């Protein structure tokens, strides 16, 4: 019995789970029910197919990432605000980061991103380790100044 | 210590060859003086029916083979003069069990063999000292048997539980000689096999040196 999983066997792992839930048994209960299919050259294919597709997705984004990755990693974080002689009067929220970086340098990057104890306020040269893609991101250089 | 040493030198699941195994037996018994090597193994048969009893001899002795003569009187005399060496009676039997073992070969005069098989069965049946009949060592011609001992035979005979054994390699006799007699025994016993006996003959076959490590081998090499 080529048990083609569409969920459980435990709870729902509809991933590469063809079990021998034998004959009319697994047969009727399980898929009559409606929680998967029998090999079906059509579905052995299926599985290899949609899996492939997700693979394209994954590696792919790895790439979108990397491109934006090296480019930014290279560039310089330029941000102008107001203050006194150390920390701006209105705190730096990388929210502000995005607004700015995208707004002026051109690239589109999150907010929930980056890594931040919190808002900073002691100007210019301080760098931010900024998460970007799940296993690689960019620790980058940020400079802000009171354009005064 | 003495033995964890040895214990790591051999393995927990492998059947080496006769010459090779030999090299390891010596590898293991550095012990005092020298540790006699023997062969010990399992006979797929059954002892509760005299029919399978695998015993007799296999083929070094000489005019050197000191012999004991187990008899009750006239036979004490006969063994004596014939040319025994240590003659006596059930008394000699009790001394052998107590702490005496000098004789090389032992003969018994068919009127004390019960004694020979039960007091010292477990005194003579290891190295071979329990008067063996159609194996020149028991008979009203105790003198005759003691006279013949020499030629170069070392016996063997299945113990009640199925294992047979004896001396197949001095821990010093060349690994080649170790392989030599280990093999020869393979032959003598292998053949000795009892008639009404099926299944699989040689079960577990091992070699070693009395006190110490025991290696299982393939008596086919």
């Amino acid at each position: 019995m080529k048990v083609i999983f569409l969920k459980d066997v435990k709870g729902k792992g509809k991933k590469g789970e063809i079990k021998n839930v034998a004959d009319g048994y697994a047969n009727n209960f399980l898929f009559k029910q409606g929680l998967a299919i029998e090999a079906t050259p059509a579905n052995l294919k299926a599985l290899e197919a949609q899996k492939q597709k997700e693979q394209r997705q994954a590696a792919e984004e790895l790439a979108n990432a990397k491109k934006l990755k090296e480019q930014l990693e290279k560039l310089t974080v330029t941000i102008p605000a107001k203050a006194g002689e150390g920390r701006l009067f209105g705190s730096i929220t990388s929210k502000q980061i995005a607004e700015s970086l995208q707004a002026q340098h051109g690239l589109k990057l999150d907010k929930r991103k980056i890594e931040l104890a919190d808002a900073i306020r002691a100007l210019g040269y301080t760098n931010v380790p900024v998460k970007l893609h799940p296993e690689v991101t960019a620790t980058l250089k940020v400079h802000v100044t009171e354009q005064k | 210590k003495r033995y964890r040493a040895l214990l790591e030198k051999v393995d927990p699941n492998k059947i080496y060859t006769i010459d090779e195994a030999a090299h390891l037996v010596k590898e293991l018994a550095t012990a005092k003086f020298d540790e006699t090597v023997e062969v010990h193994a399992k006979l797929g048969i059954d002892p509760r029916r005299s029919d399978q009893n695998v015993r007799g001899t296999v083929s070094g002795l000489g005019k050197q083979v000191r012999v004991l003569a187990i008899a009750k009187g006239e036979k004490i005399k006969e063994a004596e003069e014939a040319g025994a060496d240590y003659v006596g009676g059930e008394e000699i039997i009790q001394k052998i069990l107590d702490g005496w073992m000098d004789f090389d070969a032992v003969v018994a005069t068919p009127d004390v063999m019960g004694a020979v098989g039960s007091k010292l069965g477990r005194i003579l049946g290891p190295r071979g000292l329990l008067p063996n009949p159609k194996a020149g060592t028991v008979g009203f011609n105790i003198g005759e048997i003691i006279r013949e001992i020499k030629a170069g035979r070392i016996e063997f005979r299945n113990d009640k539980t199925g294992a047979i054994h004896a001396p197949v390699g001095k821990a010093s006799f060349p690994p080649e000689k170790l392989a030599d007699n280990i093999r020869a025994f393979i032959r003598a016993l292998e053949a000795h096999k009892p008639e009404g006996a099926k299944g699989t003959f040689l079960r577990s076959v091992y070699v070693t040196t009395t006190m110490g490590p025991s290696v299982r081998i393939n008596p086919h090499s």
Partner: protein, 73 residues
């Protein structure tokens, strides 16, 4: 022809008879019965070209039901 199995044919033929064996294991045999009988599998529920139900039996079943060759489920 209302007993068969849609996918293939399996009803009929079938002639039994008993004896009193004991043969190739020393000495011959002996012949008895002379009867004929039925012999088949089992049917169940599915549908074709707007309802129908099906029937068929065991074997074919596990099959055509798993799939379908001239109707469906």
């Amino acid at each position: 022809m209302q007993k068969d199995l849609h996918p293939k044919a399996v009803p009929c033929k079938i002639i039994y008879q008993g004896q009193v064996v004991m043969e190739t294991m020393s000495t011959r045999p002996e012949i008895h019965v002379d009867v004929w009988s039925g012999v088949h599998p089992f049917w169940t529920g599915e549908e074709r070209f707007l309802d129908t139900e099906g029937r068929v039996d065991k074997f074919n079943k596990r099959f055509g039901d798993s799939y379908r060759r001239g109707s469906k489920k």
